[PDB]
Tab-separated table of C-alpha atoms and ligand atoms in Angstrom:
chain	number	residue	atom	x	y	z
A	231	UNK	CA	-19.908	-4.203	10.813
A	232	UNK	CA	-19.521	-3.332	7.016
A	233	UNK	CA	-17.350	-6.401	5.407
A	234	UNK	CA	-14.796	-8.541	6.770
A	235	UNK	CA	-12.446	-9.089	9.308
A	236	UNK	CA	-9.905	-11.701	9.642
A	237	UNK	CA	-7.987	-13.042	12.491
A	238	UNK	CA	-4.985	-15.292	10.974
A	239	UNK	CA	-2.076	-16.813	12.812
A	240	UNK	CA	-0.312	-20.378	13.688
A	241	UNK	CA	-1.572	-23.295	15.542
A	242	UNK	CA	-2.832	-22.561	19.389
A	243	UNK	CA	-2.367	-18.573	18.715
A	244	UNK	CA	-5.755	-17.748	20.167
A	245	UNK	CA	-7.172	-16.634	16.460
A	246	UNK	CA	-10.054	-19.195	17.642
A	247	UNK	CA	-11.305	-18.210	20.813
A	248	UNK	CA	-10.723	-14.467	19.717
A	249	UNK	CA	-12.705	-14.562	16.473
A	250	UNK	CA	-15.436	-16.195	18.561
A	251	UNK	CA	-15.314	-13.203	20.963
A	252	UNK	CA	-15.143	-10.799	18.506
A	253	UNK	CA	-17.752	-12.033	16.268
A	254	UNK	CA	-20.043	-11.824	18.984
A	255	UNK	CA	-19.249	-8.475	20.023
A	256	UNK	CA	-19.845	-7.540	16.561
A	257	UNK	CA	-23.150	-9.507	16.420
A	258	UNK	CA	-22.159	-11.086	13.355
A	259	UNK	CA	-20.965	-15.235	12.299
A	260	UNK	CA	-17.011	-15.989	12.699
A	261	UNK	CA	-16.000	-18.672	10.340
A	262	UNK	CA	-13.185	-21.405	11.501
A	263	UNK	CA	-11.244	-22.049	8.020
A	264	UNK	CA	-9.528	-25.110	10.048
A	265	UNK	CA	-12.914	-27.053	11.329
A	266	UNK	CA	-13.636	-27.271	7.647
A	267	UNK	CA	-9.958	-29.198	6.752
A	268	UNK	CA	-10.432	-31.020	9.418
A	269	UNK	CA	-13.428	-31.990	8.589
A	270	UNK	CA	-11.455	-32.622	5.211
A	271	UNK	CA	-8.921	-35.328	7.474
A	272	UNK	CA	-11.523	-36.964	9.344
A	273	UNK	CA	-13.677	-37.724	6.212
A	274	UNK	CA	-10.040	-38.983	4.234
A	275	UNK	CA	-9.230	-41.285	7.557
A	276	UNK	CA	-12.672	-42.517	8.168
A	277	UNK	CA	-13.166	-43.099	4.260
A	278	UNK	CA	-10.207	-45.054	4.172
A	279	UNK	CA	-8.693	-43.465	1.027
A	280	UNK	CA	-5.400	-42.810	-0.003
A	281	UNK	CA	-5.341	-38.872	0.855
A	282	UNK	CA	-2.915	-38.818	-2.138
A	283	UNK	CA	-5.888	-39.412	-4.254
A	284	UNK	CA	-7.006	-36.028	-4.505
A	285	UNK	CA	-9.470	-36.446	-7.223
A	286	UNK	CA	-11.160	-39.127	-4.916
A	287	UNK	CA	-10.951	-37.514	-1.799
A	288	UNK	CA	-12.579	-33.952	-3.626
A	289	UNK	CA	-15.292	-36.143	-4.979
A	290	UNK	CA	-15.902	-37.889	-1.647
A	291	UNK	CA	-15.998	-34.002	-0.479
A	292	UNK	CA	-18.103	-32.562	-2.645
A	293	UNK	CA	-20.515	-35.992	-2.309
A	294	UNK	CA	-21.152	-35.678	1.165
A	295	UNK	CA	-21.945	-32.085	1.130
A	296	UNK	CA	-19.933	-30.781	3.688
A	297	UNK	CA	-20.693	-27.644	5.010
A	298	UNK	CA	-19.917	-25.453	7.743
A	299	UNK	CA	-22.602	-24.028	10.699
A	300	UNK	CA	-21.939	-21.008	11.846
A	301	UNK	CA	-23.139	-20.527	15.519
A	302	UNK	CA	-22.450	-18.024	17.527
A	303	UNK	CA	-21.302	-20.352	20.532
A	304	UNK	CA	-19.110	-21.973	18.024
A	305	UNK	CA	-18.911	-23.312	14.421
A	306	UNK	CA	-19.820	-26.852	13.383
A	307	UNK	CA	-19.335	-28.856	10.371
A	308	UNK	CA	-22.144	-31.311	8.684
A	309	UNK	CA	-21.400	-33.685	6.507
A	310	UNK	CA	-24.785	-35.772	5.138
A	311	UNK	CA	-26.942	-34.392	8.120
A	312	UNK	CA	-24.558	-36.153	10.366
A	313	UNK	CA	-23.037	-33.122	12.896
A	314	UNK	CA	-19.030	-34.393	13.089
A	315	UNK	CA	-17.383	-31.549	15.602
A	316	UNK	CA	-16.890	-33.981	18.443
A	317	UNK	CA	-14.696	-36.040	16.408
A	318	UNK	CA	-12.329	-33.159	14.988
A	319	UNK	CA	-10.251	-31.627	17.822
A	320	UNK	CA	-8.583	-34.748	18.455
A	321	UNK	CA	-5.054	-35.967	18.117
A	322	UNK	CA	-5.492	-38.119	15.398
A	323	UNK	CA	-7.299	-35.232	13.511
A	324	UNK	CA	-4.292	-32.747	14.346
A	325	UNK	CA	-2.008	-35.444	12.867
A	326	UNK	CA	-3.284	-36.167	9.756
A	327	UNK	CA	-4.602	-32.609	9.154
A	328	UNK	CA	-1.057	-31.173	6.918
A	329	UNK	CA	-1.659	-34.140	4.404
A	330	UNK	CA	-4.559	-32.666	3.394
A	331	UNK	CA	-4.366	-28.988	3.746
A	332	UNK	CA	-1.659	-29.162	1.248
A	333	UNK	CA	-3.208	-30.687	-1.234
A	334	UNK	CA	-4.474	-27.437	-4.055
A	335	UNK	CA	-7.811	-28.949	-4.610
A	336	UNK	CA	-8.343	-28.942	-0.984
A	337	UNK	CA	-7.896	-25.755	-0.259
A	338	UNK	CA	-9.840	-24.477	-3.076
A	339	UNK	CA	-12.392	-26.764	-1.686
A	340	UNK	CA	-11.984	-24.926	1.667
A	341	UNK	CA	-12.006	-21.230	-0.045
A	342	UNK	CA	-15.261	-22.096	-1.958
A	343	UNK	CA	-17.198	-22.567	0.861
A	344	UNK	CA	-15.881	-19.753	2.244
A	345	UNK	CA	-16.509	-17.187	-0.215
A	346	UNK	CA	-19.720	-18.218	-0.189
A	347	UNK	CA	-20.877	-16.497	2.828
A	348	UNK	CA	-22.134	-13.127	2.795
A	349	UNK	CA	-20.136	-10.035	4.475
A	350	UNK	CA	-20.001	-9.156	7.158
A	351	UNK	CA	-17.956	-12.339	9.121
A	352	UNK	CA	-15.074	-12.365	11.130
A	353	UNK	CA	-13.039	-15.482	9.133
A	354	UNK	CA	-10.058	-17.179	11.260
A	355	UNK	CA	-7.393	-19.464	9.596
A	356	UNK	CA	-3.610	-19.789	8.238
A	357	UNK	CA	-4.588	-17.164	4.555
A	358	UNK	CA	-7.791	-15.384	5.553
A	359	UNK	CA	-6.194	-11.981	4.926
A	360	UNK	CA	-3.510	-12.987	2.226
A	361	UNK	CA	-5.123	-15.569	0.024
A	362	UNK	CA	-9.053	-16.030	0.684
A	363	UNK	CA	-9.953	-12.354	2.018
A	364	UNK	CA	-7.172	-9.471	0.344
A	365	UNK	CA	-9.833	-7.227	0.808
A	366	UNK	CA	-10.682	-7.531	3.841
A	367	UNK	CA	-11.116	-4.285	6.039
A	368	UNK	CA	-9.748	-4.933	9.164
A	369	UNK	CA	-7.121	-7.855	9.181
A	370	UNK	CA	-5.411	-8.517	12.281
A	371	UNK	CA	-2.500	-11.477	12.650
A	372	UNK	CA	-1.777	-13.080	15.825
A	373	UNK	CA	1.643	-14.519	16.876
A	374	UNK	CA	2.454	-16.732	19.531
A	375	UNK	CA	5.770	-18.352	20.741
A	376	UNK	CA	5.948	-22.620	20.106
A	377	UNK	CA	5.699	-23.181	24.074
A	378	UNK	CA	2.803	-20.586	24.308
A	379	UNK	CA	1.378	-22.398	21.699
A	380	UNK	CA	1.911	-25.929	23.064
A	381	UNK	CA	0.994	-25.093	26.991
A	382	UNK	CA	-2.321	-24.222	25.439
A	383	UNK	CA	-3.171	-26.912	23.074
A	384	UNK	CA	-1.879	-29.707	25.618
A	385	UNK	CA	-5.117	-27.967	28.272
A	386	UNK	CA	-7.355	-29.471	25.244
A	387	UNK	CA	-5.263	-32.847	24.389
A	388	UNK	CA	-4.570	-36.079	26.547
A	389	UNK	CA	-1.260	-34.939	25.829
A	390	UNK	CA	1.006	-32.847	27.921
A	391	UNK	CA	2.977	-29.805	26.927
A	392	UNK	CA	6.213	-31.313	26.548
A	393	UNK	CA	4.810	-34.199	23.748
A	394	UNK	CA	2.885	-31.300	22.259
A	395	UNK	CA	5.946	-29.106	21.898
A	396	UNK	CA	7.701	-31.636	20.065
A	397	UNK	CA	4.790	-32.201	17.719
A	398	UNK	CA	4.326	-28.760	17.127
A	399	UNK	CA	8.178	-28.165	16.098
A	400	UNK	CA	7.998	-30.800	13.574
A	401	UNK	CA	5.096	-29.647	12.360
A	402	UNK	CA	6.480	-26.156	11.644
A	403	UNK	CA	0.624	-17.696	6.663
A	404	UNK	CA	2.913	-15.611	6.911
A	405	UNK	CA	0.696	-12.397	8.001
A	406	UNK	CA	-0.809	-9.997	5.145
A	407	UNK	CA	0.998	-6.450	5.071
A	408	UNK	CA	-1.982	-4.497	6.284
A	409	UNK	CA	-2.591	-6.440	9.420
A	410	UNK	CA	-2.029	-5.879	12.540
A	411	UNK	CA	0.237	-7.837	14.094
A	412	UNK	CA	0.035	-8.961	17.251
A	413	UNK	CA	1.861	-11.351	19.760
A	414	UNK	CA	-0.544	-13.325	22.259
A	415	UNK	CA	2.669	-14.303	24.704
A	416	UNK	CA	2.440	-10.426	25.760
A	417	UNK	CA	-1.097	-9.661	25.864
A	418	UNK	CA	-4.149	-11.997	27.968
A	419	UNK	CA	-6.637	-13.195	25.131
A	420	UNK	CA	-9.300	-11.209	27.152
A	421	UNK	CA	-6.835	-8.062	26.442
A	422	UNK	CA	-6.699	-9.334	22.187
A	423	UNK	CA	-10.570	-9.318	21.884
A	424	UNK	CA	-10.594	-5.957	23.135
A	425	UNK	CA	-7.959	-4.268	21.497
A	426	UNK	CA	-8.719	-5.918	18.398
A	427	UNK	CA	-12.331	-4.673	18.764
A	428	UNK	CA	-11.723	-0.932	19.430
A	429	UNK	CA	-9.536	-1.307	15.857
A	430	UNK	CA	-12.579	-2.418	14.344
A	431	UNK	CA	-15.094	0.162	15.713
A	432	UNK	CA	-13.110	2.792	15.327
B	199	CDP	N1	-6.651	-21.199	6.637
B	199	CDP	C1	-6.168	-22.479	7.090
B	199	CDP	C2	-6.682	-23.027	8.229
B	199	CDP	C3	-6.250	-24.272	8.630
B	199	CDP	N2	-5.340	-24.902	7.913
B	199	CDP	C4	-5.060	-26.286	8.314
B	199	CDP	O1	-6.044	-26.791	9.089
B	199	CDP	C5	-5.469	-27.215	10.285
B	199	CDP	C6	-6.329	-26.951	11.420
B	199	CDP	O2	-6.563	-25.591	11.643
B	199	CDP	P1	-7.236	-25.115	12.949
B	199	CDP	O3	-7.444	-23.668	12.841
B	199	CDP	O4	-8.517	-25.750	13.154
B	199	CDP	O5	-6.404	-25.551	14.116
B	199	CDP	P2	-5.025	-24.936	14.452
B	199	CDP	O6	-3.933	-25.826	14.140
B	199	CDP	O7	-4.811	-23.753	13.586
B	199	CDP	O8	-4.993	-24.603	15.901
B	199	CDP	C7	-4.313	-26.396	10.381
B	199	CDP	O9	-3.368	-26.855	11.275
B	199	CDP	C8	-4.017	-26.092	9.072
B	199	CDP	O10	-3.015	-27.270	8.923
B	199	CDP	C9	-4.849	-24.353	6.802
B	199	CDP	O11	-3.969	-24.898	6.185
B	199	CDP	N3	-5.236	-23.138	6.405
């Protein structure tokens, strides 16, 4: 459209698959915050670095130039020519992932690449309308209960719902006051896209 929209909420919510949709609707590029921390594990694990090291992991970061494709069928991220998608939506990845994300330099890492890109996007993540996009447009936040959320990611994990439940739990954005809010248990993801698109156009 204009400028942005963003599409925040917790792990297995939907915001994926629904900025996808949207972003295509829209004929414009939906950026995945997460592929690019990810990407920010799988380097750390594969590098075989202490991810406390933050000053060595940003450097190994920032070395490799990672950056991430956006494609309309879905986003990928490169790091030195090498395409590394396949390897991200994995257990091990989801794991690991926190250690990183938390780290400050990591996220700024994250939000640099990110404000990058020229509007208009849709942008999906955790702080897409609080901390990386406040001035966003059209911010919408989408909730989902933990067994919601778990039934869903176990369909794309070896693991099964109940294992995935109890990872999520101990793993537990708080949504930006000008978005709306949303709760995926209640509506089909098919229902989300649409809704969330006739907010956008009108
Ligand atoms: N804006 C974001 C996006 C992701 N993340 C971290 O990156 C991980 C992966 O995000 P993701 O969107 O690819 O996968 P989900 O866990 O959200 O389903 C998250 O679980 C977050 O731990 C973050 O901290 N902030």
């Amino acid at each position: 459209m204009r400028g942005i929209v963003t599409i925040d909420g917790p792990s297995a919510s939907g915001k994926s698959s629904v900025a996808r949709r949207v972003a295509a609707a829209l004929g414009v590029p939906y950026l995945s915050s997460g592929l690019l921390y990810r990407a920010a594990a799988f380097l750390a694990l594969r590098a075989g670095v202490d991810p406390g090291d933050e000053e060595g992991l940003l450097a190994l970061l920032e070395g490799l130039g990672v950056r991430l494709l956006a494609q309309a069928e879905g986003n990928r991220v490169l790091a030195d020519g090498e395409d590394l998608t396949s390897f991200l939506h994995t257990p091990e990845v989801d794991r690991v992932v926190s250690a990183v994300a938390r780290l400050p330099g990591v996220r700024a890492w994250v939000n640099r690449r990110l404000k990058e890109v020229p509007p208009p996007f849709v942008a999906e993540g955790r702080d897409m309308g609080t901390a990386v996009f406040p001035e966003a447009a059209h911010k919408f936040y989408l909730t989902a209960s933990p067994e919601v959320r778990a039934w869903r990611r176990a369909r794309e994990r070896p693991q099964a719902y109940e294992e995935v439940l109890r990872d999520l739990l101990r793993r537990d954005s708080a949504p930006a006051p000008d978005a709306l809010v949303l709760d995926t248990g209640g509506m089909t993801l098919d229902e989300v896209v649409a809704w969330v698109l006739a907010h956008i156009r009108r």
